[PDB]
Symmetry: C3
Amino acid sequence: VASLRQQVEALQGQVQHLQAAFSQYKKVELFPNGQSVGEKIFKTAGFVKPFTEAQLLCTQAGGQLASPRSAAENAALQQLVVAKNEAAFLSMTDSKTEGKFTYPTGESLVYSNWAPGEPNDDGGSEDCVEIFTNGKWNDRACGEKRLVVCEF
Amino acid sequence: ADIGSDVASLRQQVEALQGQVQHLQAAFSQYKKVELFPNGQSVGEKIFKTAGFVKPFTEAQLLCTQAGGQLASPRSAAENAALQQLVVAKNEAAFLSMTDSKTEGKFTYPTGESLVYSNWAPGEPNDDGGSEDCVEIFTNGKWNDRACGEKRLVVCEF
Amino acid sequence: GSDVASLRQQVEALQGQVQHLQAAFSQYKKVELFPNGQSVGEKIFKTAGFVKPFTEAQLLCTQAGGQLASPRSAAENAALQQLVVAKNEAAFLSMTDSKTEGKFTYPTGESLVYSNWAPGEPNDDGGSEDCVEIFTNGKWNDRACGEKRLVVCEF
Ligand SMILES: OC[C@H](O)[C@H]1O[C@H](O[C@H]2[C@H](O)[C@@H]([C@@H](O)CO)OC(O)[C@H]2O)[C@@H](O)[C@@H](O)[C@@H]1O
Ligand SMILES: OC[C@H](O)[C@H]1O[C@H](O[C@H]2[C@H](O)[C@@H]([C@@H](O)CO)O[C@H](O)[C@H]2O)[C@@H](O)[C@@H](O)[C@@H]1O
Ligand SMILES: OC[C@H](O)[C@H]1O[C@H](O)[C@@H](O)[C@@H](O)[C@@H]1O
Ligand SMILES: [Ca+2]
Ligand SMILES: [Ca+2]
Ligand SMILES: [Ca+2]
Ligand SMILES: [Ca+2]
Ligand SMILES: [Ca+2]
Ligand SMILES: [Ca+2]
Ligand SMILES: [Ca+2]
Ligand SMILES: [Ca+2]
Ligand SMILES: [Ca+2]
């Protein structure tokens, strides 16, 4: 029992160092292309791509396209869009049923920040969503190229 | 019921936990190297990281502060050399955190404390044009006071 | 008796913190790799995003604590190919035949244990191609070390 008690104390020291070092590296990592909000992390690839390609990049990376579910998350996302000065794609679309936007899971939206008059399915062909530098949303053609931002 | 068995069970758990920590330590060390390549430099307990682009002092300062750090503030020859590596790699002079905006001729850190280290280029600081309150570090590592409105490489320290 | 019990709850608590750290670390690891890195096995490839001549690229990787990309299998080669395709730029590998023409080796001097030469390669075209580049199609080509190619290191 003496040895065990001694080992445990040793582990505490190792863990304290890791937590401290990790805390520092998290800040370093997020600068300047990431944003942490709650338990979510948004990170931009810094370039533009059409929706399908953007979606694949995020999913293959173990995440998904930016999916702001609250005003706080939307503002965090807006910071990256503003930094790059490029509107970005969100993960949501109404490709399945026109007029009904859903997350990749199929769940209906729990938050939205549509610009006045949007979504309007302009030209009868806008199933994707973009977020502007002002944080507002607009449905847009999925074939258009927008800033790639994933969430993890 | 058997104290010996209870101790053995705890031993088993401690061994497993110890394994987890050893694995994490090795994985974290590798990740640190990956993170620092190619825009970061670690010196002592400080880490310098560049954003890869230029901005005027005010915007550069806000970027670093909002990221939870501050503009590069080399406090020794060792830290200066580390920062210089990034400046050289990007071939772009960078802003430091220090200014003499409060009292002309007296440079201080964001906290207000006076410099504990300096590496001024010959003849600097010279407050050229009577309007240079910020500081830039050249690819040769030397410092020069510069107009804060000018754009220089953004490098933060964490 | 009571000691083992107190040590128990102490271990239980510490394990909780480690697993929380493990969870946070796993998340930041994914974030780190997006979009300039690729993990394969215990190896991690990461591109600097810019091109450089061989010597300069090699120094960058070594000074960073790693080495130039050195795919030792089809799986590692495929992972590396992803970064090349994503950046749409051929990249230098670590291997060269600078010591003995026609014989490519890793920085340690060991002979290749895997290769993926494109048709007709290596051909030492021009009479001086001692470095190696990987194309977007994953195939290899010996290239003049003085040429500039995408910098990709492995850690
Ligand atoms: O007196 C003029 C000389 O030609 C002087 O010019 C250079 O020095 C510059 C100095 O580098 C800059 C910077 O300090 C601006 O941030 O300000 C100036 O304009 C001069 O003071 C250099 O050639 C000196 O050797 C020379 O003395
Ligand atoms: O076109 C009629 C009005 O001028 C209308 O124009 C703007 O609205 C446009 C939308 O922004 C746009 C967007 O939804 C595409 O993804 O589709 C359109 O072409 C218009 O609906 C704006 O000035 C409106 O205020 C105005 O009503
Ligand atoms: O580095 C030079 C290249 O190997 C080039 O050499 C020759 O010109 C041919 O074999 C080409 O098909 C090949 O692509
Ligand atoms: Ca539709
Ligand atoms: Ca639609
Ligand atoms: Ca619209
Ligand atoms: Ca002044
Ligand atoms: Ca001044
Ligand atoms: Ca000056
Ligand atoms: Ca040769
Ligand atoms: Ca050759
Ligand atoms: Ca060739």
